[PDB]
């Protein structure tokens, strides 16, 4: 078939870059991988190419354009590549982390949107200039064609000033645009889509709480289609127990730790963001999956610590049905913790009985899997309990292929290939066959999506 | 009748001392009053006597001791005031802010009691030094009684550590106790006891969710009648929007604001407790009832802070109904907001009816008195809605009280005076007289006592 319509998306870190390549007319993810220690001795891709084994190589990587060069050079290589030659990429979509309130969706790159994100560098200081970065190296080495930002706060700027401002100085909204901002905005789009596929519901129509639980956690309340209020702050360190990160807490207890230990501002907000958390309370653990084995040995600090993120999450929950003025059709679950947490999941949802949220428990044992959509509420629960795994990379990619096309808008008046019914990852149909094989009570709790043919 | 059990309530801040005289054995309290501009120029008391006008002296108070002498001296004098001599004054009860995680209940004071309030006055660096310095003041002036601490912190030492931890290294609470600690226990004691004699129920048996609403505010979940979570953090600073401080905000927030202005934590501090909430949003104003005149003359900033304060407490009911882990049997309205606070009220309940609680806009509006404890919920709410005028210095009368004749203990093996069904206020039960001559249907919203006689 036609292989020419290919999509790069690429996630840049201080020391890193995440890529996946996306053949749009096929449909299919045809390599994702990652450049490690960019910037830093022993820079390396791993690359995964559908069908075939990983592939690593170690090649210097001094900034990130050599990491974007060593990407394509993997990609267009004979024997390990997966596409014919650079030009085989028709657009590229970048992560941005941080837009302010000057985005409101995605954008093609240009010169004056350049300097416009460095206006807001300063709002998202630990994750801008690395993505800003990768949009320069990456406009380098593919200079003829659109690169796409795709931007985590974007989602969120549906919100009303009711719940995006703090109650601070109107000066400092007003001087440095100090507001609520929420993060992991394409996770939300996306599973907002597919769960309103799953209820057999127009979007705008939609009322539902999403629970994205990966290394970074945050909660989305979708009244009426659109983010009405999200768990992340300003910055991604507000709201949910996190793995390093603290959520929550008494603004005045860094100023207070920061008198009885000497650490000045940088010096907190990494201790906060990096040595907080899960990590921060069982001392060692970051990994849910380390947090549970763990209390499962008798570790009382992985005890606390479990606890205290299923605690959160059930006050988040009930802030957010309190948010949404009537019942939510449904609670989504999804990111790692949330597609293979099953502890998690049913220690949150037993707490919530009375709000509507009925688990099936033995639902729940079978969701755990990142291959399929589940629904693992018991049948009459008021509240649906999905569980979808996320796909951050798809809008991404659909992004910048609606924007090279001339078609892309904020999501209110735009359509997204996955609202459709009959939408397929083909990749996780293939991992959902096999799944199967070992486990065929898994297709029991598949949703069953009204419409599909 | 007889007139010598007397107990004295101070609560001393850096430039002032509140104070009130009960009348134990009469039950009636004899005076109150505060003295202004302690320590500054133009220091003056203003002493409000039972049936007497007003009396006010310009008296200087370098000191804290000077103020208390103050006190004695216009208690004692032949015309104005209210006791014989100092003598008939048989013990002292003092406010202290934070006692860390040190002291779960009141007590008498001694050397090394005070000792110990000074290990933990890093914890309330901005209420504890003054409410030290006016036990020392007092324990100068009046010799001879015991002086006791009733500490705003105790109520909430029954926080289980999922509650009361923050997600932070581990090495923080351990070495500076940093941990969720809360405020407003007398408050939340005495509404608390009053909820459960309304219900009809042993204290042990009752769920409640508390909103003490004042210039500062915070809520309480009670979960069998003790403390479960609440809304304020290692300080007051965080939780509910308040008159000056921001409660909840993104812990990152305060530094980004620090790089974009050059101000350091105190400042910083002073700027998140005393220039934001209502007034950092208005810009203006402090009072909730200036608030409510300005939205009703269509200022949108003052309608935006209502909106605001409203929406954080629909979330923070949500999250609390959620820790219950079942419907409550009551959410209690207290301090002047929730006294006085009809709109507040009606906004707050009319977001949270699908969670059970259903306000009656006609029993709301009537509710508008400090006289009496009121049902303000439609007759088949399943969550009853009371409003219940909270009297933290009956608590601190009461400790004082039980701890000189060596009853005391911590509530829960602990029974007060207010927990009987025949319970009178004095005071109260004559302004209510006065406000039923003019609103007489406020008789039909007073709440009707089971077992009263």
Redesign the interface.
């Known amino acids: 078939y036609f292989q020419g319509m290919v999509i790069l998306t690429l996630n840049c870190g201080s020391s890193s870059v995440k890529y996946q390549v996306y053949d749009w007319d096929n449909h299919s993810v045809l390599a994702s991988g990652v450049v490690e220690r960019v910037t830093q001795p022993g820079s390396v891709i791993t690359h995964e190419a559908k069908g075939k084994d990983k592939y690593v190589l170690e090649s210097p990587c001094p900034s990130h354009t050599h990491a974007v060069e060593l990407i394509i050079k993997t990609l267009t290589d004979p024997s390990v590549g997966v596409i014919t030659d650079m030009n085989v990429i028709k657009a590229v979509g970048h992560r941005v982390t941080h837009g302010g309130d000057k985005f409101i969706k995605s954008v093609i790159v240009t010169p004056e949107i350049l300097n416009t994100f460095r206006e807001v560098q300063?709002?998202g200081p630990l994750h801008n200039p690395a993505n800003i970065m990768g949009i320069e190296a990456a406009q380098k080495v593919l200079p003829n064609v659109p690169h796409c930002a795709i931007i985590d706060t974007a989602w969120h700027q549906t919100m009303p000033?009711?719940?995006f401002?703090?109650?601070?100085?109107?000066e400092?909204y007003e001087?440095?645009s100090?507001r609520?901002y929420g993060f992991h905005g394409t996770s939300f789009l996306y599973t907002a889509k597919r769960a309103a596929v799953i209820l057999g519901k127009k979007p705008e129509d939609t009322n539902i709480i999403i629970a994205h639980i990966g290394n970074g956690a945050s909660m989305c309340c979708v009244k009426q289609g659109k983010c009405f209020?999200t768990s992340?702050?300003?910055?991604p360190?507000?709201g949910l127990?996190?793995g390093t990160?603290?959520?929550?807490?008494?603004?005045?207890?860094?100023?207070?730790?920061?008198?009885?230990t000497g650490m000045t501002?940088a010096e907190?907000?990494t201790?906060?963001?990096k040595?907080?958390?899960?990590l921060?309370?069982?001392?060692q653990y970051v990994d849910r999956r380390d947090v549970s084995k763990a209390m499962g040995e008798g570790d009382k600090?992985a005890r606390?610590?479990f606890?205290?993120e299923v605690?959160?999450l059930?006050?988040?929950?009930?802030?957010?049905?309190?948010?949404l003025?009537?019942?939510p059709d449904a609670i989504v679950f999804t990111a790692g913790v949330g597609e293979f947490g099953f502890d998690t999941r049913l220690a949150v949802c037993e707490?919530?009985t009375?709000?509507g949220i009925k688990i099936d428990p033995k639902k729940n044992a079978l969701a755990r899997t990142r291959n399929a959509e589940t629904c693992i509420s018991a049948d009459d629960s008021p509240v649906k309990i999905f569980v979808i795994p996320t796909d951050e990379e798809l809008v991404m990619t659909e992004d910048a292929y609606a924007l090279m096309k001339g078609t892309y808008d904020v999501h209110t008046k735009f359509t997204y290939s996955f609202q459709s019914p009959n939408y397929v990852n083909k990749a996780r149909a293939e991992g959902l066959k096999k799944d199967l094989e070992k486990k065929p009570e898994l297709a029991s709790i598949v949703v069953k999506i009204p419409g599909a043919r």
Chains 1, 2 share one sequence.
Not at 245 to 260: N, Q, T, V, W
Not at 280 to 283: A, E, H, L, R, S
């Open positions: 300063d709002l000033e009711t719940s401002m703090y109650a601070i100085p109107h400092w001087k440095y100090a609520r209020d992340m702050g300003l910055t360190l507000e127990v996190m990160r603290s959520g929550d807490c008494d603004p005045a207890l860094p100023f207070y730790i920061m008198r009885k501002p907190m907000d201790a906060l963001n040595k907080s958390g899960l921060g309370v069982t001392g600090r606390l610590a606890n205290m605690y959160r059930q006050k988040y929950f009930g802030a957010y049905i309190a948010a003025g009537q019942k707490g919530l009375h709000l």
